[PDB]
Write an enzyme that holds these catalytic residues in place. Sequence first.
Site, PDB file in Angstrom:
ATOM      1  N   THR A  94      -6.789  -3.324  -0.481  1.00 35.22           N
ATOM      2  CA  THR A  94      -6.425  -3.884   0.583  1.00 35.22           C
ATOM      3  C   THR A  94      -4.965  -3.798   0.728  1.00 35.22           C
ATOM      4  O   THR A  94      -4.040  -4.104  -0.139  1.00 35.22           O
ATOM      5  CB  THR A  94      -6.695  -5.306   0.368  1.00 35.22           C
ATOM      6  OG1 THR A  94      -8.008  -5.747   0.089  1.00 35.22           O
ATOM      7  CG2 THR A  94      -6.500  -6.327   1.649  1.00 35.22           C
ATOM      8  N   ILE A 130      -3.655  -3.509  -4.640  1.00 32.49           N
ATOM      9  CA  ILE A 130      -3.044  -3.788  -3.413  1.00 32.49           C
ATOM     10  C   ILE A 130      -2.102  -2.642  -2.924  1.00 32.49           C
ATOM     11  O   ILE A 130      -1.580  -1.739  -3.936  1.00 32.49           O
ATOM     12  CB  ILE A 130      -1.878  -4.672  -3.899  1.00 32.49           C
ATOM     13  CG1 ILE A 130      -2.345  -6.113  -4.395  1.00 32.49           C
ATOM     14  CG2 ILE A 130      -0.859  -4.973  -2.709  1.00 32.49           C
ATOM     15  CD1 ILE A 130      -3.210  -6.959  -3.244  1.00 32.49           C
ATOM     16  N   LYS A 131      -2.550  -2.360  -1.783  1.00 35.54           N
ATOM     17  CA  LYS A 131      -2.137  -0.960  -1.305  1.00 35.54           C
ATOM     18  C   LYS A 131      -0.629  -1.135  -0.627  1.00 35.54           C
ATOM     19  O   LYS A 131      -0.790  -2.096   0.585  1.00 35.54           O
ATOM     20  CB  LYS A 131      -3.158  -0.595  -0.173  1.00 35.54           C
ATOM     21  CG  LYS A 131      -2.999   1.085   0.336  1.00 35.54           C
ATOM     22  CD  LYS A 131      -4.152   1.587   0.878  1.00 35.54           C
ATOM     23  CE  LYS A 131      -4.170   2.836   1.498  1.00 35.54           C
ATOM     24  NZ  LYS A 131      -5.709   3.187   1.930  1.00 35.54           N
ATOM     25  N   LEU A 132       0.291  -0.228  -0.739  1.00 35.83           N
ATOM     26  CA  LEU A 132       1.663  -0.400  -0.064  1.00 35.83           C
ATOM     27  C   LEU A 132       1.890   1.135   0.222  1.00 35.83           C
ATOM     28  O   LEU A 132       1.428   2.068  -0.419  1.00 35.83           O
ATOM     29  CB  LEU A 132       2.674  -0.778  -0.977  1.00 35.83           C
ATOM     30  CG  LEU A 132       2.329  -2.255  -1.665  1.00 35.83           C
ATOM     31  CD1 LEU A 132       2.307  -1.880  -3.504  1.00 35.83           C
ATOM     32  CD2 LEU A 132       3.880  -2.981  -1.553  1.00 35.83           C
TER      33      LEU A 132
END
Lengths: 316, 316
Positions: A94, A130-132
């Site tokens: 996400t 967690i996607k960044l």
Amino acid sequence: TDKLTSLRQYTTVVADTGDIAAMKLYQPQDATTNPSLILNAAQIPEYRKLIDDAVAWAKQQSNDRAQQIVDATDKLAVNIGLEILKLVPGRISTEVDARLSYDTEASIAKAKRLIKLYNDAGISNDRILIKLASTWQGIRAAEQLEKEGINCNLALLFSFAQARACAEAGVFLISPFVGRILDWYKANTDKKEYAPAEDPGVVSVSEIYQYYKEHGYETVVMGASFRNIGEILELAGCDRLTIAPALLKELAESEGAIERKLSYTGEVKARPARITESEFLWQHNQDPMAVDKLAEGIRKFAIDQEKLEKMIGDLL
Amino acid sequence: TDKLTSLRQYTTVVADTGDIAAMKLYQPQDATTNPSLILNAAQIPEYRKLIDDAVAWAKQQSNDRAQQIVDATDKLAVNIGLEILKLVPGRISTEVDARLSYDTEASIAKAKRLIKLYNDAGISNDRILIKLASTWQGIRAAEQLEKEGINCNLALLFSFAQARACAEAGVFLISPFVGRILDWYKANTDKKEYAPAEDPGVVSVSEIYQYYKEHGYETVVMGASFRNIGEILELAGCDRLTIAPALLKELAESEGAIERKLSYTGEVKARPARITESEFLWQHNQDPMAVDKLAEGIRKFAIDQEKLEKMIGDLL
């Protein structure tokens, strides 16, 4: 047998979509989403219930319209992830608001907020990534989050400098964007057609894979964003590959076993000193393609974030 | 009268070249140079004496070949500036090694080194402008140098974010690159021909000029890098303009007075809070043109720096 089944012997298959219909059809281990996919998924009629729940939940958390829009948008992304986790045994990626890509502190806070929403739903951290965006600030944010038990997916990775910085930060996984690299060369170069083996995106991921295994880095390498199955087959052996439903279909419908392409059979070598911000910036900016694509990718994801907020706004 | 003479009523004329022949012909107030111009100037036969002096001087400063090449290359840039200062009453801009563009500390040290060489020659700081690329690191370097009595020329300025950050840092002068902005639009846009008034570079400098005067910033605005005299005439009224000899010739040979285009006649307005690094990065990267051109400009200047060192190397 078919290509999809054969690929699974060497590489972990991941589905790149927010549509649960694909999860049932291809039984991937993990699934990835991003702002653009979340926006498209929100158009899916059966997902209407997820939107309503998000809005309802948000209105129960506060009476501030500004905060409600933010809470509703975050909850919606989490609700979609929750539906997917029911169909996959692995993780869901996400993505944090792309507008925070150059703000380390704000990115850490946002990541913890998303983790909080998943935890409130009973989901533990080991099922989430967690996607960044892989900017220097995003990498520094990820290094911190990993120390606090939050695994990250460093995306929009284009230059070798980004790859090196990510491995040195000890991030859980990286997502180099193969197809977008090809797009740049097709548009800014004389040559418009590439054999799979000469595809710029493929060559890039192959070199990154080698560098990582050669030095014993545990960061998972997951090729992403493909334009054709040729790129995928040429990367057979990569730790994981996240593939769009359309390409997943083509693999499943093509017969013939495939051979492993990516492998490192030597021994592990000693790691160099860590790259500094100055060196990172110099090297990243030496890559015309990486300079263009990283900035562009962030711009597009930010726009899709805004479009989703607009949509949610009209429902409050 | 001619255009050149008329322009001088509204704008301070600066020559963009390392060739002293132009100084005598156009009598500019200041002169600007950069790595590419220094490389070309080194090809000028009469400049042979300047190179020999630089090499000789360097060999007298140390016995380390590595240091000699650096000392010789810096001394050569200073020697050329010294020749120009004999013909102009104003300042000379000398650029720091572009390879240090993303390193604040290294850029400050290099700037002080160049200042040292000018001081050893008897030239005081008020006759010099140290030129650096307008990256966030370059701006932070400049802010520090200005506090220590070293005036700077912030170049390769493309985005409004860069302009704002420079004014807030209190730098002596900025050099927005008009022509290179046009180059980007010609190559990445459908429209290939622009009326002077619609030239992207002209519009950019005009907006910057307005923003600066409107808030009482003392930073000098000097348009640079032109493609035609149309851009120049459309910017009549800009504090200063650095023009290449070829365009200087065209202005002097064309008859007809010109009218002032850039002016701010209102009252000064209050300044906003200072922009932060995060905001700077977000805004700068929102500009596709600025993203490409800043990185590209730095790459090219670094290559020319290397070519000069190569040349000097074969003379040691």
